[PDB]
Nucleic acid binder design. Structure first.
Length: 431
DNA sequence: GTGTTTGAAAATCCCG
DNA sequence: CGGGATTTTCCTCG
RNA sequence: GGUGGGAGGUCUGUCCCCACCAUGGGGUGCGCGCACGUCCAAACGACCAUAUCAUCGUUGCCCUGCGACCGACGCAGGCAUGAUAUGUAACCAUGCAUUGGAAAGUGCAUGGAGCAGAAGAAACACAGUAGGAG
């Protein structure tokens, strides 16, 4: 009767929220800045055909950036020689297989630039790290002993991060996953019995709003024979008697089930669209960015600053005191702009969070009841041909819905492929 | 939106 | 001053 | 009684707290009152204070007056609207410094955080939010 079922998992990522002291948050911010500086400097040196960053030339002269020269200690030593602020980040966040270069840079150069040599690709198309896409993440390796769940509370744990002392407090410890040969151990029981990986990857991320999250990735090592190197389970709830379900997507409903139940697509954007438009037109007039009277002002004053520096340097010879080059500042957004910016970010975060949780609820309720799903297509680009759904689908981001259905129908191993829904289910059964 | 991934073991550095 | 904490090193990239 | 929100990992209601609207109208039943259920009325990312400004009749009115034309115009004014900045916000307990004879705040270190029902795979990369430079 709707009993929870423990099933084996190949990968997992506990998403908790850190509650660090201001010093701890400052240190992690410095670590993020160090990572972004490393990325930017390395991927500016990649375009110069530097042998220390770029690999061995081919017989034609084609040179690719070999990342082994980026994970070696010599490159990091040279980097920390060039600037000291890069040393404020752990070398594991850079030199490891889940670090800055071997994981992020490799994917960036294999997807964004389509895997092309630095002598045949431009700089404008490559995406750096800046205010538009800041590096709010670092991945390090910590043993399980650095994760000590609090005994009193079922959802509180203390996390110690490298270069930070204080054992940052964490909330959101999912106790619905069990470790061990058959998932009969808690976290402490598995750690004390030596059934956890001696090195575990954790990602510390800072979202758009001021907040911190941690992702403790649990991954089985090898797949030799049939026994995983590290075994962890998770209890999920399934309907006592599952029945085949044909899924049809309508206009006013996010999903229609052949059984009869319905879920009305809340579509939280429009219900909050007035507030979003009000805030947008608000900060469009404030003294922060996205105003066209602050962007232009900052860009201009930067231009005259550069021109004055040039005129002071070469024409004046920079002897002792030539003229007086004014520096001042490069402008900063005001507090009244900042509060509305933070509130706006909080509000899209709330909308996205509401949509994510609603889609999780719908997918969990439908996956357990269904033994064989009958969705039309895996891609939303194949359902906009009629264009009728476009108005609703503009806010109804069904990419997340499709992904959630995909990885919630596979853990129970449910295969994936009202009158219309019944016809679709019948066709799927026939095929 | 669409696609792809997810450590383990030594060599070296440093505070009660 | 020596065990533990941090740094490195592994492998494949046109 | 409603609306919006701040912290308790996420969603709904409740718990604690912050800022606002209502104490209205109507269509019908019963004996001016009670109203079975509603529909409209608001309140939508704070509120107060401080300066510095709307501008093509604006930013509405008072026209506070003045002047000329034949209801309309200009000049010198005032409030209220709106809109940009400075100080100021949102659960509980302890310690320190500082304001306070107190009552109670300020800043720091922290420490703790539900209740009922659902769930909880995260990150990165690329057409974009358009920029950042090395």
């Amino acid at each position: 009767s709707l009993n929870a079922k423990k099933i084996r998992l190949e990968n997992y990522a506990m998403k908790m929220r850190l509650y660090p002291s201001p010093t701890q948050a400052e240190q992690m911010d410095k670590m993020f800045l160090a990572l972004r500086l490393a990325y930017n400097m390395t991927f500016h040196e990649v375009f110069q055909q530097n042998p220390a960053v770029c690999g061995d030339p081919d017989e034609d002269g084609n040179v690719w950036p070999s990342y082994k020269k980026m994970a070696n200690k010599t490159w990091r030593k040279a980097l920390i020689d060039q600037n000291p602020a890069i040393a404020e980040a752990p070398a594991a966040a850079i030199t490891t297989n889940n670090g800055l270069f071997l994981s992020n840079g490799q994917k960036a150069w294999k997807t964004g630039m389509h895997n092309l040599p630095a002598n045949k690709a431009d700089r404008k198309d490559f995406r750096f790290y800046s205010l538009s896409k800041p590096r709010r993440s670092f991945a390090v390796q910590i043993p399980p002993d650095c994760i000590i769940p609090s005994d009193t509370n079922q959802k509180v744990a203390r996390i110690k991060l490298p270069k930070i002392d204080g054992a940052i407090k964490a909330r959101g410890f999912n106790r619905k996953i069990w470790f061990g040969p058959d998932g009969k151990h808690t976290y402490e029981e598995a750690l004390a019995a030596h059934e956890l990986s001696n090195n575990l990857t954790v990602r510390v991320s800072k979202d758009t709003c001021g907040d911190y999250f941690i992702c403790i990735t649990f991954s089985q090592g090898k797949v030799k024979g049939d026994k995983p190197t590290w075994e962890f389970y998770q209890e999920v709830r399934v309907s006592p008697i599952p029945e085949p379900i044909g899924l049809d997507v309508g206009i006013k409903d996010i999903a229609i089930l052949n059984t009869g139940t319905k879920y009305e697509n809340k579509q939280f954007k429009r219900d909050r669209a007035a507030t979003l438009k009000k805030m947008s037109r608000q900060l469009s007039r404030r003294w922060g960015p996205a105003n066209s009277a602050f962007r232009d002002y900052n860009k201009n004053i930067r231009a005259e600053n550069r021109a004055l520096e040039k005129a002071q340097q070469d024409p004046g010879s920079s002897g002792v005191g030539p003229e007086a080059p004014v520096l001042k500042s490069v402008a900063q957004p005001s507090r009244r702009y900042l509060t509305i910016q933070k509130n706006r970010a909080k509000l899209e975060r709330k909308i996205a969070r509401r949509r994510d949780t609603y889609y999780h609820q719908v997918t969990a309720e439908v996956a357990g009841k269904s033994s064989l799903l009958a969705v039309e297509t895996l891609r939303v680009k194949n359902m906009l041909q009629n264009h009728r759904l476009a108005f609703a689908l503009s806010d109804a981001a069904m990419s997340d819905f499709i992904s959630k259905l995909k990885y919630k129908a596979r853990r129970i191993q449910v295969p994936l492929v009202i009158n219309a829904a019944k016809n679709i289910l019948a066709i799927a059964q026939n095929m």
